[PDB]
Structures are given as structure tokens and as C-alpha cells.
Write a protein that binds this ligand. Structure first.
Ligand SMILES: NS(=O)(=O)c1ccc(CC[n+]2c(-c3ccccc3)cc(-c3ccccc3)cc2-c2ccccc2)cc1
Ligand SMILES: [Zn+2]
Length: 261
């Protein structure tokens, strides 16, 4: 992707992606608006299993469109299974999408409601061997989406907030060991699920989306720090990293299932 030029600006934003990535107008694109009254409770869904006790984080990176907290996924240590999934999915990284204002920032919406941000914990299906092969499969990834609203601070997020100063610009990374992602989960694991895609190019249709109904609360100061990051690299005109979210796409021929009544 050394020649990719997509972004979230006015000239390379979501409405332009289809030119370089035609699958942008595909049949199972994400995110989507979750119509709570049309999502049907599916009694056959199993409880979700999030096992992060052995998660091993390694680094945090500003990649020019978000920041990723990467994990060592060379062994089965932080896995997601159950719920709508068959098999075991291993955690590889998490990142967020956020807005320039508290009134927007999430990718998925709930009855058109936009949250201040959205956390994505990305997992790949171990039956495919590695992440690169998994994204080429319809059931290659499971992304756990969690909404963020502004209110009380999330203690578990502060370590992330404090390290952002060190990765202000595109390409900067910092050691980020021993970060426990369990500190970013809400109390309830009730969720909605549907088949979709990566929400940034290459927009591959390889994701089983699992979006939690309960958002976590983060403080205004915490999200404010996210907004001080830069999309640009060091030494270039500063462009604040805000509004790095893709808007809701057509649901087309898909049903969103709810794990709860
Ligand atoms: N929002 S999401 O649906 O959860 C989603 C998950 C994974 C991905 C692919 C991961 N990814 C990201 C990437 C994208 C978004 C967030 C974090 C990293 C960047 C480059 C990148 C490209 C150019 C320069 C710098 C970074 C690449 C990839 C990527 C692609 C395919 C295979 C392997 C990695 C895309 C979307
Ligand atoms: Zn994402």
C-alpha cells in the first residue's frame, strides 16, 4: 500500500474510496446503522467468550489514519470465540475512530445515533494461519466494536491517552507493553452481529461484526487528547487526526441479529 492516498479529508475521503477500491459499493460493506427495532433476537447465538487474561501488547503506532495498539499474536493468548463465531479468533490489534466533536465519531450508529468514538478490537480466524490470509476469507476476521460516550473517565484507557504525546505524527511508534485490554470493556457483553467488511481500504468483505450494546464512558479530557494527534508526518503541515470514521453504508441483503431480548 505504498501508493495508497485515501484518507478522511475532503478530496480523498470515504466518498472517493470506490475509485481505487470498487468493493466500497459492495454487498456487505461496513459500518451500518443498527435499527434496534428490526434487529431480531437470535436464541441460537451463544454467549460471547472474550479471553484476554494472557494478552501481550507490544507497541502503539500512529499509522496516519488512527493509532494501533498491537499484540503478540504468535500464540493463542487473547482470543474471541462463541457468540456467532465458529472457531477461534486471535487478537492482533485494537484502534479507535473518533470525531472532531462529541456529537460524532463512531462508525456504526444505533437508530441513527452517533457516539463520540468507537473502539475496534480486531481478531483473525486461526484456521487461516495468519492475518494476511484471513482477510481474503469471508469469515476471516471478527471485530469487536465498542462505543464510547463522553462522561466519566475510563481508568483503563488512561495509559493509552498518556502515551499519545510520543506518537503525535504518522509513522511514530512507541513500546507499549503490559496493556490490559480488559480495561476497555463495558460490563455487559450483549451485542448485535452481522456480516460486513473492513471499514477502511481495502474494505475487504471478511468481517463478522460483533458490536456491543453497552458503550463505555471516557472523559472529555481523554477524547480531547485523541484529537491532538496528527494525520500528517513530522515536519509537515499539521492536520489534526479527527473524524477518521466512515459513515453508515447500505444494509442491502443482510440481517442484524441481537444476542439479547
Ligand atoms: N476498521 S476495521 O474494520 O476494524 C479494520 C481492521 C483492519 C484493517 C486492515 C489493517 N491495516 C490497517 C489498519 C486499518 C484500520 C485500523 C488499523 C489498521 C492499516 C494499514 C496501512 C496501510 C498503509 C500504510 C499504513 C498502514 C494496513 C492494514 C492491513 C490491511 C490488510 C492486511 C494487513 C494489514 C482495516 C480496517
Ligand atoms: Zn476500525
Amino acid at each position: 500500500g505504498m501508493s495508497h492516498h485515501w484518507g478522511y479529508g475532503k478530496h480523498n475521503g470515504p466518498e472517493h474510496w470506490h475509485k481505487d477500491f470498487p468493493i466500497a459499493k459492495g454487498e456487505r460493506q461496513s459500518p451500518v446503522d443498527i435499527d434496534t427495532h428490526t434487529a431480531k433476537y437470535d436464541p441460537s447465538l451463544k454467549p460471547l467468550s472474550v479471553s484476554y487474561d494472557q494478552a501481550t501488547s507490544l507497541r502503539i503506532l500512529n499509522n496516519g489514519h488512527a493509532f494501533n495498539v498491537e499484540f503478540d499474536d504468535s500464540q493463542d493468548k487473547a482470543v474471541l470465540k462463541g457468540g456467532p463465531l465458529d472457531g477461534t479468533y486471535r487478537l492482533i490489534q485494537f484502534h479507535f475512530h473518533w470525531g472532531s466533536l462529541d456529537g460524532q465519531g463512531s462508525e456504526h450508529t444505533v437508530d441513527k445515533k452517533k457516539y463520540a468514538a468507537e473502539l475496534h478490537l480486531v481478531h483473525w480466524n486461526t484456521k487461516y494461519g495468519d492475518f494476511g490470509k484471513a482477510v481474503q476469507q469471508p469469515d476471516g476476521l471478527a471485530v469487536l466494536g465498542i462505543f464510547l460516550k463522553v462522561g466519566s473517565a475510563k481508568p483503563g484507557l488512561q495509559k493509552v491517552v498518556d502515551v499519545l504525546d510520543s506518537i503525535k505524527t504518522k509513522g511514530k511508534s512507541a513500546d507499549f507493553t503490559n496493556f490490559d485490554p480488559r480495561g476497555l470493556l463495558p460490563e455487559s457483553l450483549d451485542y448485535w452481529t452481522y456480516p460486513g467488511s473492513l471499514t477502511t481500504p481495502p474494505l475487504l468483505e471478511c468481517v463478522t461484526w460483533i458490536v456491543l450494546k453497552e458503550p463505555i464512558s471516557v472523559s472529555s479530557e481523554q477524547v480531547l487528547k485523541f484529537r491532538k494527534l496528527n494525520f500528517n508526518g513530522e515536519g509537515e503541515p499539521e492536520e489534526l487526526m479527527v473524524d477518521n470514521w466512515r459513515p453508515a453504508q447500505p444494509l442491502k441483503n443482510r440481517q442484524i441479529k441481537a444476542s439479547f431480548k
